[PDB]
Amino acid sequence: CRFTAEGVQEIDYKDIATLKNYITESGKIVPSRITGTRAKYQRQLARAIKRARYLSLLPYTDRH
Amino acid sequence: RKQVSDGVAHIHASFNNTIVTITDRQGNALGWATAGGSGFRGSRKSTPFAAQVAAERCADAVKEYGIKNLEVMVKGPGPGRESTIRALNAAGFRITNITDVTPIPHXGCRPPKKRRV
Amino acid sequence: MRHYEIVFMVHPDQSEQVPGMIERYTAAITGAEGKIHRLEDWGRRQLAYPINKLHKAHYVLMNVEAPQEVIDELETTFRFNDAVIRSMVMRTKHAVTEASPMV
Amino acid sequence: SLSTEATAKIVSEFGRDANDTGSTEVQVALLTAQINHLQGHFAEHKKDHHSRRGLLRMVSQRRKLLDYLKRKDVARYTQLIERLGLRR
Amino acid sequence: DVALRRFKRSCEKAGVLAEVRRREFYEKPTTERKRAKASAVKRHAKK
RNA sequence: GCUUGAGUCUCGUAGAGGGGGGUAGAAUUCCAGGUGUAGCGGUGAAAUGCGUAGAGAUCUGGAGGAAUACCGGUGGCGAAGGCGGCCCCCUGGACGAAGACUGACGCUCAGGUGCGAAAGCGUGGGGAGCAAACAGGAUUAGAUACCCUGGUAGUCCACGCCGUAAACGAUGUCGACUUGGAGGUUGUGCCGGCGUGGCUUCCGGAGCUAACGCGUUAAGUCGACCGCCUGGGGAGUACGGCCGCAAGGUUAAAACUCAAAUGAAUUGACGGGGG
Ligand SMILES: CN[C@@H]1[C@@H](O[C@H]2O[C@H](CO)[C@@H](N)[C@H](O)[C@H]2O)O[C@H]2C[C@@H](N)[C@@H](O[C@H]3[C@H](O)[C@@H](O)[C@H](N)C[C@@H]3N)O[C@@H]2[C@@H]1O
Ligand SMILES: [K+]
Ligand SMILES: [K+]
Ligand SMILES: [K+]
Ligand SMILES: [K+]
Ligand SMILES: [K+]
Ligand SMILES: [K+]
Ligand SMILES: [K+]
Ligand SMILES: [Mg+2]
Ligand SMILES: [Mg+2]
Ligand SMILES: [Mg+2]
Ligand SMILES: [Mg+2]
Ligand SMILES: [Mg+2]
Ligand SMILES: [Mg+2]
Ligand SMILES: [Mg+2]
Ligand SMILES: [Mg+2]
Ligand SMILES: [Mg+2]
Ligand SMILES: [Mg+2]
Ligand SMILES: [Mg+2]
Ligand SMILES: [Mg+2]
Ligand SMILES: [Mg+2]
Ligand SMILES: [Mg+2]
Ligand SMILES: [Mg+2]
Ligand SMILES: [Mg+2]
């Protein structure tokens, strides 16, 4: 888990370059079992991505 | 009648049938064929072969328009997903891009009840 | 007084009204004994998907400390301002003063 | 819940000190403060049953503390219920 | 054929046809939880 | 009196806990328009159905309801029922660290009271999708079914009612004690290790168990209090009472009848179970 390894407090919805690593080409949130993210950070990540999607900083889907 | 050069093949690959519609990139249809209208009913209609023949008959329908480039939009779970694209390449269209456009609800509506066969 | 992070997205046509919007909104905050801990005009960005046919919008980020009342009032301002296509108000635990990942 | 400042005010009024947070009088005053505060919440939110279960625990705890205080020291009980405006 | 094999693999990656098959019919929540528990116990028996 | 049970305070942590309000994107349906032309749809196969009055397909715009893909997990939270996009507002509980404080304030609980899935009921809304009833098409010896095409209540919202479920861990609550191993989740101390809490899984020892199994989350060893059982059927029925708008719920017999009914496990045989 990158986030534990950097002592990250909360994942930022604004940090798009980070968040892009945890979404697929389709825009789907990648499972923690693939990425090795800790459960606590996977939940923060999911929330951050959902916030970023609302603000149209990330796509919901590859075919908008 | 008029020329286009670059259109879009829409493959509606259902479990029961394959509809192939070639449009321009504005989505205006030029021609179409179906496995069901290609001499296949029942079991045979829902096969990759019947979908291939539909792809060929659709290519015949759009030959007047003189299309060379197709973007392929594949929609649905059916047998005619792959066979239709191979047949379009074999008809001498250049396949520029293959997108899956299968509609997925992000939840959406309650589906029909399970069949007790 | 609570800490809030406000992002609002302005219609790209009204990009020239954004300096005016910022000074109006920040005055409404500081008028009621609030504090602007951070303001960042990100400018016009490509939207990840279309909103009301717009493929771009002008983003502003504000981290504010304010009474709940004026933030409720600023939310009503966003709703009725036709230029503001989308907004998000979020509570933060503490004041955020540092540069965003955008800058 | 009760704010840090509201809590500390009640501890001052009802304790023998700022440290005297454990006193039955303080506990009853703190529970009374929040019971009274939550009446406004449940006026608006009549179907917040989950929160109301927490309110009814506050009510039950206060009753048990008052009954303790009554049997230990009736005069302290009498003073307390007067200050807080409780029936019993 | 490279680009078609690439499209095929991209669809398997995204799990499109698994998603369509799942959504063809309604699964009661009881049935969903029952199969989730079955998948958990199977994955554990793998270990 | 005491502080060890039980509470209070201080700082912090995780969480689909609850109530209210807002909003987003995907999709279905519908409406309108463009392109286009003979099919579509459906099945085991069909047919009903839809389509030249132009469907289906495809594109554009619009309307509306409902649900929130991925994340997602023997993951989390909640007394249980249950709770899942995002945002705000109001709000309940749990847990940890270190310390202070109260001083047995506790445990259990008949009656009582509250909460209580789904269906159902009342009034007023809403209605996309789904779908009891219903209709038609099949299938069949028949087919009041399974399958298909439709489709109303209902599912959704507000408020009120109902009070039941295999409401299950088929395991009442509280406390104490009794070898281990491997995980998950969530705190925390110290220096990637080493500890120490909460919650939660799998396996297993003693012990227990009819056996199956349970096994520090006990079905072990004990204590407190409550609930409940006393052969099968008749019957959770009748009658009466209470409750309910009703549907019904709840409390709850008897005659009569049988010599069984039952649990677990064993050997076969059998399966339109598997290999
Ligand atoms: C470890 N606790 C478990 C319990 O969990 C339940 O109670 C706990 C509280 O004590 C809860 N925390 C938990 O959420 C809840 O599920 O459920 C019981 C159910 C019971 N039929 C048996 O299962 C066995 C099966 O009967 C058997 O067929 C299977 N092979 C193995 C199972 N263990 O033993 C388990 C076991 O005792
Ligand atoms: K607006
Ligand atoms: K009692
Ligand atoms: K209906
Ligand atoms: K045995
Ligand atoms: K007890
Ligand atoms: K009891
Ligand atoms: K008898
Ligand atoms: Mg169907
Ligand atoms: Mg909370
Ligand atoms: Mg729990
Ligand atoms: Mg009772
Ligand atoms: Mg209901
Ligand atoms: Mg109704
Ligand atoms: Mg239907
Ligand atoms: Mg039907
Ligand atoms: Mg019962
Ligand atoms: Mg249940
Ligand atoms: Mg269960
Ligand atoms: Mg029971
Ligand atoms: Mg065991
Ligand atoms: Mg036993
Ligand atoms: Mg009865
Ligand atoms: Mg009766």
Numbering used by the authors:
A (entry chain R): 11 to 74
B (entry chain K): 13 to 129
C (entry chain F): 1 to 103
D (entry chain O): 2 to 89
E (entry chain U): 13 to 59
Reproduce the article's own wording on this structure.
The ribosome is a major target for clinically used antibiotics, but multidrug resistant pathogenic bacteria are making our current arsenal of antimicrobials obsolete. Here we present cryo-electron-microscopy structures of 17 distinct compounds from six different antibiotic classes bound to the bacterial ribosome at resolutions ranging from 1.6 to 2.2 Å. The improved resolution enables a precise description of antibiotic–ribosome interactions, encompassing solvent networks that mediate multiple additional interactions between the drugs and their target. To ensure homogeneity of the antibiotic–ribosome complexes, which is important for obtaining high resolution, we used highly purified in vitro reassociated Escherichia coli 70S ribosomes, to which each cocktail of antibiotics was added.
Two secondary sites for apramycin were observed on the SSU, overlapping previously reported sites, as well as one new site on the LSU. While the densities for the core-scaffold of each antibiotic were very well resolved and could be modeled unambiguously, flexibility was evident for parts of some molecules: for example, the C9-moieties of omadacycline, eravacycline and the pentacycline, ring III of apramycin, the β-lysine of capreomycin and the C14-moieties of tiamulin and retapamulin. In addition to the first layer of water molecules that directly mediate antibiotic–ribosome interactions, we also observed the appearance of density for a second layer of water molecules that do not directly contact the drug, but rather interact with the stabilized water molecules in the first layer. This is most clearly seen for tetracycline and kasugamycin, where multiple waters generate an extensive second layer, but also for apramycin, hygromycin B, streptomycin, tiamulin and lincomycin, where stabilization of individual second-layer water molecules is observed.
